[model samples]
Target: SGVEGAAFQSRLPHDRMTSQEAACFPDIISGPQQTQKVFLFIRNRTLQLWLDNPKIQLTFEATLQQLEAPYNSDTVLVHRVHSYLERHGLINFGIYKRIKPLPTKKTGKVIIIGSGVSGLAAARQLQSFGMDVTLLEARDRVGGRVATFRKGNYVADLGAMVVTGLGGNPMAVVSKQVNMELAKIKQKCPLYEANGQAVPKEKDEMVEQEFNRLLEATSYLSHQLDFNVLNNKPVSLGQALEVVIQLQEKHVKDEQIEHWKKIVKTQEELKELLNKMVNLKEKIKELHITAEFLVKSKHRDLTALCKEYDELAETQGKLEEKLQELEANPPSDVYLSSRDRQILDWHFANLEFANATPLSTLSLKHWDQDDDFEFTGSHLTVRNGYSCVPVALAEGLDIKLNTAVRQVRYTASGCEVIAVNTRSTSQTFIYKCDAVLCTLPLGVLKQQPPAVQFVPPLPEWKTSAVQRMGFGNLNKVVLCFDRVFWDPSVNLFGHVGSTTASRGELFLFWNLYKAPILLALVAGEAAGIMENISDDVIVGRCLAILKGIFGSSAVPQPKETVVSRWRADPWARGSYSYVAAGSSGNDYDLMAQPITPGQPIPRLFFAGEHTIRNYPATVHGALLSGLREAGRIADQFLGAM
Candidate 1:
């Protein structure tokens, strides 16, 4: 959407198309009545023919400048054209004669659409298997979701910024091979606020240790109920609760087992508190009877008992007051607790068990088979952002920009791809090829243009699978300052703040997650809301949020801020795709299928984070899917004549 052509035409001054002197002379001489536009077209056609002449390719570089021809933006196009002549006509005359030798025989070509990480890896893989690959990218630049645009002096990732981990990441091996540098990251909170103040901070070691201990205990308890070992029916929640109490003697710590013993409150006092807390539960009836017994048995010398209590009573009062404050205003609305909502909302919950549920739910709902994926570790990001990986992968692949593919027609022979060049005019190209791999984001394919048809149309099962899946739009807003203000030396920072707004509304600030850069990690629908608003309006909103979370004094102003509008981007439509309520794991497997030559492997093979089974919507997933497609293509080249 930023620029139309590669000529930097958008940056031109005075809105001038061309000068009279720059106009083609031959067309002007050929027809006296020719319009300026017509003359230009004629001149362009003639120049193209001259340029296409690989024999004069070297000398034509100088000749074209004399004729005022357009500058060649794509070096690959020139190289390819010149190579074509040398291979057949033996033209040892151009600058292209210096091309390095082809790594593989330019025999069979495997065409991949989209130059994202996955597509790039597939090209490399297929190339290794002795197959040439043609990568078609609709954007002016490559890198599907892995795209970063240069904004003034800064680089903004239009795609994802950081990858979660290196485990099983296809790009990890490639990265090492390419001598790519990777950094390990600590759990630094990107957003934080405390006492109505925006604070970049992290949970201290004490809190983290306790949290981890509780989680481990919970996990150990969950496995005890596994039906596989017990050979018993699935326990009900009530049965599970009973098991937890009985098993407390054998498993739970002594502290948790006798927590009530540590309380100074008499049985009577605890009963009254339980009743007041929940007015109508069955537990209230049980508590009421317990209160009666305690009251009846207690000593009547209350003043003496109070004197004996002393500081213990005072400590209890202070704890009660703090508890009351927390009850009045709970923190962190984004801390997802309800499993039902996580399945429904697709929100990012920080729990390990919570993270596993969505993928498990997908298998349960759609596949009806065991296709679950596990949560892996995470690592630091690239300075240029996650898009840098995709850009690096696509570095060697051939790409056709500004080319919009229209339809995919699968066949016994192979596949037919229909595309239109919509730059200046809608000129159609019908490419009949061995295989056509479609790397469009899931959102794009869902549109399913009525004019386009798959051979035998896809099976109804596959269609239903595609229809059921859900797509997501996660947005990122990055703000940069001239100098690190909050704590330039600290690698991490944060605080839990109390506010009238929902828990999701925490104003967080983190500096140098990737050095010298600060970020605001907004999520879910809220991030979309910011992305949807006009830049001016959104900038004001960010400032307002900052002011509210951290007193206006902390952040008087920002040096610069950049907001990513993936939702508004027509090509991407949103950030990444996820399994919705209806879509299943089978849909993922189907999405990962490749376009084989004989079978209707289908021309539209999908690859990207959205297509991966375990780590959907991440850089690792994109890389994995790309390699999977490559594997499929390589299998076809077996014993090729």
Candidate 2:
């Protein structure tokens, strides 16, 4: 009913088209499209009208219904509007009231621990609502894990790199606000054999095909597990693997047996055709075409048969090679060819690389179960380091560097935060505030003697959550050379080694084309291995890896090298958090819950990526969690006033 009249007006020419032009003409034009255009136009106008007159009374339900009437229950639009208001810090928009600014006079004091994204974001929000906020950071810098370093004329991110899933990501919005230059990362990762040779294209294709088959098999197994769980008959992944193995073998056998029967039938038919043919040469030609068709079509109903056949043929070839080896030595238990073994190792390494941990340590159910924001655009990184986003947030804020928080005591009245000045030879100080927002990393909280202690101890629930959560470690070895030795176009290089353990050592090589630098990544146990080694040894190992990929003695030594020891850092202790085995997203919710939830004012609250289960271990999660706590504080205190 609110559709604009002009939206229905045609922008195209009124002339009748010829047959050629008419063939490409649209039968249905601008009917639904015009309606949507009008709906959006009216929706924006309505929101502006309501915002301009805060005195207008409208319930959330009423507004939702009003929006639904024009849009025909388009729930996505309504949901977007809700998020838009929340993101802009406009709470209770539907309720009629005077939209007052944050108090200029001191409303109360808020002490936020750790000047990371979470703490900084919370401080900004609370401070906007008249809360006198102070940030206590252990490091000399504001960013906790978003650390940046420079060498010569190049800037590198020592901690967090690209902001993942840019759309709806708070960091993406902040990057725009700070005018941070972002370049879409167009990566080209090519796999290489151990002999410093790029894997043959056909071999790569076969590997991909086999890998996809593995995924399909695993996905089927996973689906069965989900069904089993729903039916109250759940089994471990090991048990499921056993079931899938038997199932897969039977399936392969069944398909192969059927294909064999078809081949026998085809042979019989060919024999009859040959007997009936007048010309023997014509019969042979006919038989050849028939054989080719059968082979190409993969025996019709034997799609699974073809996969099994290929695998068996490859295995037979390896076994034949092994037989020759056994004839020569006659004492070997291994039968897999070196290249094939290398391919298997690379597959495992790729899995570990993606999960940031070995498959053995990762939780099967929740490993790939995080809520992912769908971003259609390219993954982007700032020309500067990731620290710029947090640095911009810290502007005009009272952030105390070198102040390490030790304890937090919270009551219904207020909070007392105790810290030590690491810069001033461990000089201790105490700060009083109405509220305290803790943004400490999961690793720090999981420490044997935790970095920060909650007075009277945290609730049993919170303590249990902290213990159940998993903290992972991922380190980077940034080496800057005088010249780029590798392929200029290749952004990423993966090595396929012979041994499973040795394969994941230097899992990834990120070629930062902007400078003559290569950032090698070692994660999970490999990162732990790097942590114990000397800088020289690490560099040597990296050099050895480079030589292995780029040919021995062909690569030159790096002019400068920088290694990150996140696990070794007392303030950080590790990289990020993940839902551990026997844990659920509910644990994240429990961690975020205020210490005094039912109280009039939430004196102590938690904010961090770990607290945001949907998008944990991300900069956006940290920012959103911080804003969420701030909004809670505002709703309670501001709404009451």
Candidate 3:
């Protein structure tokens, strides 16, 4: 606000490098050898822009104030910039005001569960602190979801696959700490499948153009809606239609014509759906009324509800039957028709764009944009596999094997961890410790543990947060083949011409054998659909889509195929947690804080993806939280000792 020019001014040329210097690193870039470094430099700069957008907006005013806080004699430029803005009568960017940072007071011993990246990060933070700390994990391995599964002298990441950004991601910081090698992928993404067949390999340009056109259309529509509905109350959807018709008759620019066409089509489709939904509601009401009368005449109170209920049920069945029939065979009467298939495609395409944008985040103003910018592709799975990272972490830490925790108790002396030891004969064992860090995943907290309970129960907010925060499931379908059957002519990771799946059931996120193997990812709401399908049926769905795109050859029976069902995995109930609609607040601050001694609660601290801000649902988030929790403990308790 004080000096717009100073804030937007370009940095020194030293931040960039010459093409000749960049040409040396061929592996990093495309030229000789050093060009890769230049590419990464520019890429990192772009990522920085994305990450800084929201943050800079928040800090812009404060930064100016800091500059002017001390009226100095020598630093005349600061006063000049402030005076410049003041003279211009431009105090805000569209009335942009800074957000006040919410403060929290709760702090103590933090227990981190799920030794995935988040837990490890939290531990690192708390370890240097003088406070107590304990880390707990349910799985035999500590990496939790990020662990690499072993098969045939090779390691594969069946869980969190890759990181997105390399610039300043905490995972990048850890990779540097442990000296891990990370590489940027060199291949183009999304090469297309057309109607029931793979599009010609060289036709990527055409496919991409069509995809971009669809994206442009939808984006334009969204921006218009945003401008009109959110920023200012504009015309209604129906009124917007009339405006579009008028624009056509008046003959606007070609771009304007195409843009309005797309928007009008979408709005019309929504109107049709709304009308059908209204009719359905009316039918439900009418049936309910008729059923009530029949039940009332019978004079049988219990049977009255039964007869009425059956009639209502019958009406619903008939309504569903008619809808299905219409869907299967609609008369040639509909215009601007948008099928479920098209809508699904649109949604996936939108997600593809979202995912492609680095550090894409979510906020109240923008739903589904949070945490998007927190990570980039620097995340590398160990060549041996992702498990290598975990193994590396566990190498130095003293660990107990085959010890199952039973209960935890906190006393004035310290925190006590009770567990059952196996192999040396079944026996209960108590491990006394200064502190315990819980790395358990969120799903485990859903049920009250028979073996574990809070001394006086946790506060209502903490308990509610644990229950209310959304936990999402994701499934992995891994396929192994005796020989590579995918047509060599197609790009290794083929994309579909259609943004959505034709099945109307599952989004076909399949890839050509990237490394003599093919893996398909299904997450979010679609993950639930797979729960009902058998292995053969799931495989059949995969085969059907592959067959549609690549002909009969693509459907060849795999040498072996296995599905990893995360929903059924009792240890991890689901992959990672996500913020549901209307679920933002300072609850995460409480989750991050540790329980204190003599607080009438178990001296258990928490750290994990869910426990941290910024990078939640990410490896770096877990790692950062772990480090923070550990640092807190070291400062509070260990340093004094």
Candidate 4:
């Protein structure tokens, strides 16, 4: 692709060769097998051409098939190729191109605590500005909640797995640097009972169809409402559902009544159909009873008919009130049928898992409130692990590992930091800097004694912001085996627990197709409970579920088990942060705002996933927050000076 190719082709002491001679030359130069070398040469040439020319699309090309022949799937190969191209500057992404490098200046000294994605990102961005930055990390390594566990050749993620919604994601950005290849997870989340018997595919499909029907109705109603509830608004999905039902009811009544007035027979038949269609089985039971009575009564008893109609009206009124109550306050109760409720539970768990919490604690009002960044690609995972992103970013930076920050004393003049060597009990050190950017997890910040205490106590508003914020726990129970028994192709499969009380308790399993590993995820109260229980109990339950699915206890046992207890981990008291029931995105904004916004040199600054309202509890959120704080410093302090 470079001078090597030119030299490889150069033969006979630079004698000018004709086009025919060049074309007829042996395809491969450095291989024993000519057949293999020719294929390699063609593949490399095709890739080089594809990278150099924007007109030639490389993703779906046959050359990718040939080059990625060594990988598991075509998707894996394509992503790796893309990663290689992007890292080597062969393919320039618009987002990366748009990021104008920070104006380099020896601005001032800055200290960042916690070498998580946020801290590492802050250090990297500030380093670009030529600031004398020092990243003090409590742990010996980077990546914080993003961690990878390796057992011989088999690799599994012990922490954050998927790179959700890839466009403009910081992890995605850094993936290029590390040449990290993420395979797009083609997810088909099937529902199953606690006993491991699958809820029949058809029944599952019916529930999905109904859920889709409701979503479609809600989406259509959004167009007619005062403001589109789906767009940049703080309205619960349940409220949206209520509005959809009201519109649907009004539409059905008007159409049927008008048709009946014109044609009696047609109208008569329509009522029966309407009744059947409207009664969502087990939801409005009283309607079904009254409708049945009206249909069966042969004698034209007008008075009796009137009484029955009134009963039906009263039942309808009650239904509306119940729906209204649900709209106002979404339930923690199991409201749907066995199959449907399990399906719905799985749905909530999927969404809640994103924030590392449960639906009851999640703020439904502002759940999807984010700037519309067109996510074109699939939700993928790096072949290595997500930890590679931070490791790549923290390349040559001044990172003081194993230096646990004990306290941060900041003033109008300068900031002094006290740190201890985690490895040795006797050693401690102090550092003075002009400013300090604290990227500690919300869980750590909210701790009573606090991992790192701020001198003179933080402002009342800051304290309130921290207090109002919610930190959640999401843990993984990774089991490694000698051989695979479960379907290797199934991306996601979930167990529908017996009760709402059992919701989110190891309900989901992800099949790591790359290796013989199964990842069981739990969050909210379930995660906390699992943390307290013995590993033997946890592993036993996992095996029980497996036996239930396989229909036998003959299923192979795991050779190794790794249970993550993020809440119990001293460095990370909880997995990630989430927006609570009463709070909104504004709370996240407050958390991000400087203690003294207008100051020339702000003493205290915050950066974390929680600080980024829209994309909270994500690697992208953390990176964005760090970059934001760095930009703030550059604009207010350095630029002003």
Candidate 5:
């Protein structure tokens, strides 16, 4: 996880133990292994002695490289370290330096695990309340899944690319703070056929409109029908769509019988059709017999009218042909062409990608609350880099990286946090704090053997809530070509597979930042299947599909390629959360509940994308979850002496 802790082995606080003991600069060399130790035992020997010389306090004012040494010390001295770093050490105590700051001292000290948006937001919030916060991250880098892959000029969000919306988004708030340039995604998304041609406008929109209408009706069935309660049967989104499309294609049972009853005036010529209707459904028997009286009386009147119809006898062939035409393939809507059928399947696959799960697993009842989180304004991608928001939010916080917390033991009084350095071999720390805010990602929280476990296990409800939520994975293949071959005006383009099973295979391509780069999104079953496959294989498939859309000669090999493996990432087992089959929105609230709400101190709290109702699987949701817990825990740190 790191180079080594060969020099300056101390951590902080002057109390915590390590090879580098607190060494005052006034008198340095005294230890048995003096050469191996930092001339000073890091900044930890004494806050008292550091106060005496405060010359060491200027160390924080050094360059980043110069600052890395003292700050990387094992004993992190989190409690007063910020005060020292932020130039507040002189204002502390010791007579002449004494300054009566304010009525309230520090509210309390809290340890926050994970340095993602949520944890970072909470750390920043707590700092504003004068609450000491220590960040413990397992990874060497900060942003857990919100990472950026860089190659000098090109910055790609290999994790989360879009800002989604701006109005209520926390990532948007970060953008406002930094005035970062944004590239708005356009609505000019076009579709291409495998034969190196764009699908005709009318045909494409017809299928698109039909697909939209079907999903709308599907939403009605799920919400208006209250299906979960009425049927006492759990249906998946795929099952619901099947029912919707099937019913949509034909008239309902009663409606079909009622429809046939109105046209029963002529019987003998329709006798064969009557028997066919009976073959289709015996329930039409009531209408067949029911309309017989009218047929008979009408026939008796028509017998004399037959002589009256002698003039029309020659045209019987035309009348017979009309009845035969009506007898053919009876249904409400015109059947779709096999090609249109494939396009419809493409629509469902796109929906699957949108949710980052297959249609088979998404719940019809719990899948969507229509989470009204979408912004009316344009969806945005950072022109700089997506990680810029984290960097901006990470401005003043001295967040620790690679410090994987092992276990947490919380009692009615306080917390005992056991942690270790991921990079170094002989360093371990046990921090005791008043409150502990756990901002671990739901993906990480759900890991087996667990990254950070509580001494007394979390309540059953919380654990089960974690289990019930569906964690989804979406991987991207970022391919950059030397020049653009596809239409430059359109922000999006797509390819439909020959078989229905390949719907998500190279299904979406986003023209990133209006550059030659195209990010091909692979989701649902495709992403899971391709997780084990090598990049070259996936890239080959992408190029093959591109060849079908834009001939082999036009589809040049990529100059650069980056593929994401979210499923294989041990720290984050998957991408984000969704309301799975067994769970409801209530589970979000349940997962967010604190461990010991009864106790003001030592309560373990949770925050992540999986915790908030209405806004799971969003960076804003993650940030909001963090600030939410920080606000509550901040209340706990009140009126300190």
Candidate 6:
């Protein structure tokens, strides 16, 4: 029954976007050129644990190298190992992890659809691989959803604005290369009451304090639920919030949160001592297991390691005794008092605007998982425009603007693409290529290609993923004023919405410093509704809110107005994608899977913000997806050769 040297090539897999051959499991290791090997001591239970908690994998691997091999699911290993490492300041933070060591000496022809960052990225990569590349863009411009509106000096991004997180984002490289001026706007939005008065900093802190803790509390409760066990229907973020509120807000602490400065100091002390006990016990157990394994495997005296384990356990009880003195709070309620509800509504609205999904529809578990890798540091705004990224990517590449892809017919060896001039449908042409990369946005895919039909049909898995994942829209109502009004120091400000439904209706105000302008973002439900209204009405509605905040006397009429209708735009049916309530990160992975399988090089490929799970709805994510596919395509050619 022993798995000693018994191996299986079966599945199971940290990483910040990697296809590297690093062992993704504790009881296993990768062989070479993409092969996996299972550890001899692995059991069926160990297999389950590998999938259940990868933290276990880290521990077992380290344990393997140190003294190794356990039989069961080692439940205590992960908590103990991680807990110890985390407490001892030993916790550390992957890829194949890089480009193909050998270049594709051969050449091939590839047609890329859409000229957004992804497509442009693929085109650039393939070009570097000595391949013939042509990009077909439906819009008249190559930027796609990242289109910039520059009239006179007013440059407002219609979609995909902001350079979020400079660290590790590929866009940072482009920002450096473009040598463009960037407005480093790393400031908080000062919330104002509906009565045109500042919500005093103290009141704001105390009230906002509860809401912030509410988020953490909800996180704690959600983790307790174990949403990823994969059987039951997962909960929505809103639903979880409602339950915590129903249970009584005091579960998170009632009054002491007001005196957070004191509690925070005390809590830190408790947690440090608390963590020390956890780690000491974990190490003791690990060493005990190691001592047994070492004796059984090779025959040794109860080594000094064994002595150390017992000694550590002796100290473990001492800290555990201190644990008797230690302690720690809870997450939101739309049902709070009117003003509390107002702030709650406004906060949720801001999240809606950020995720491009209504608060009600956001996935509780998968919503912010990607936030782990989000670039930190000051979020930058290009002084010129975001389009410069695509422009820089498009340089020296052949991009056929206004040429919309109509249909793609793929075969095992190559593919045929049908294209039409957007202005003149009568002018159509067919192009054949060794491979085709499709960079259609998720919203475009969900709409079933909108006439850019895929012949021979897409895989059912891909279609299902397209339908399952979420693509939300965020529109901007840009107004350029002759003179700056209101506070100019802050990057942005907003007023708490009167009601939940109206929360996202002109909540966030951005100070577009390049020009004397303010952009009111209408996300969530309001984004789709605002598009149906007339331009002046939209501008009037925005102005009304502006007046409500700064008063009509202080705010002046804008010289011009622009409302971005992303949903109305046929090519880009929405802003970007997010992991929806019914969807998981796997859906993004599914969307990324190349079609026409079983060949070394699939004739058709897909790339976009939606295709990548770790980096979706991000410019850098879109860029990475393109770069990833290009390399994959290149690898295919290399593999076939």
Candidate 3 similarity to native, TM-score:
0.57
Instruction: Name every residue pair that clashes in candidate 2.
Output: none
lDDT of 3 by residue, 1-641 (tens): 21222222211123343353244322344555454433333333322332333222223244334432333222433333332222211121111123643123323454443456555544433432223334555556677788565677334567776665764454443454355666543344443344454344455454345444544443355455542243343322223333443444354355455555555665565556557556655654565469889777655654555565566566556655655554555333322123322433434433422231111121222223354444434434444455555655554333455555657776666767776654453787766776677766776655555335655465677788887565666676676666556654322343343433322233434333245566655543456557677878877777776677667765678666677767666666777665543344344566776776563533667777778656667665666566555544554553422
Best by the TM-score measure = 5
Ten contiguous residues minimizing lDDT sum, candidate 3: 87-96
Model 4, span 63-145: residue lDDT tens = 45545344314454355435333322233321222234445557788889888878877776567556889999888888788
lDDT for model 5, on a 0 to 1 scale?
0.68
Q: Write the per-residue lDDT of candidate 6 for residues 522-592, one digit (tens) a residue.
A: 87888888889988998887787788777789888899888889888889898989788888899989988
Q: How do the predictions measure up, each by TM-score?
A: 0.58, 0.71, 0.57, 0.67, 0.73, 0.71
Model 6 per-residue lDDT at 276: 65
Query: What are the lDDT figures for the candidates, one per model?
Result: 0.50, 0.68, 0.49, 0.67, 0.68, 0.70
List model 5 lDDT by residue over 1-641, tens digit each.
01122111111222233332222222333434552243223333333333334322223222122334554453333323333323212212111121223235666789988888888878876775577788888888888888887885566787877777664344543564566788888877677765657778898899999899888887888789766532565777777777787876564555555545433433354565445444534432333366889898766765655553453443445546655555553443344666787777778778878788887677778788636545445788878677876776676676888788889988888888888888884698898888888877788788887877788888788898888788888888988788889878877887776666667777888876457788888877887888888999998988887887877799888888999988788778888887787688999999888887342444798888888886788887787787778767765565321
lDDT of 1 by residue, 117-172 (tens): 77776776565445777777677777777766465555556466565565434444
Task: Give the candidate order by descending TM-score.
Answer: 5, 2, 6, 4, 1, 3
Displacement of the residue 12 alpha carbon in candidate 5, Å: 43
Model 6 TM-score is: 0.71
Q: lDDT tens digits, residues 182-281, model 2?
A: 8766666788776668887777777666556655565565655452242353333324434554665676667666655655665565455445443443
On lDDT, the candidate that comes out on top is: 6
Whole-model lDDT, candidate 3? 0.49
Off by over 4 Å in 3: 1-114, 120-135, 177-179, 186-195, 198-382, 411-413, 421-426, 448-452, 487-514, 597-602, 639-641
Rate residue 220 of model 2 by lDDT.
Answer: 69
**Model 1 segments beyond 4 Å from truth?**
1-105, 198-378, 448-455, 489-510, 513-516, 548-556, 595-604, 638-641
Candidate 6, backbone clash total: 5
Model 4 global lDDT (CA atoms, 0 to 1) = 0.67
- Higher-TM-score candidate of 1 and 5: 5
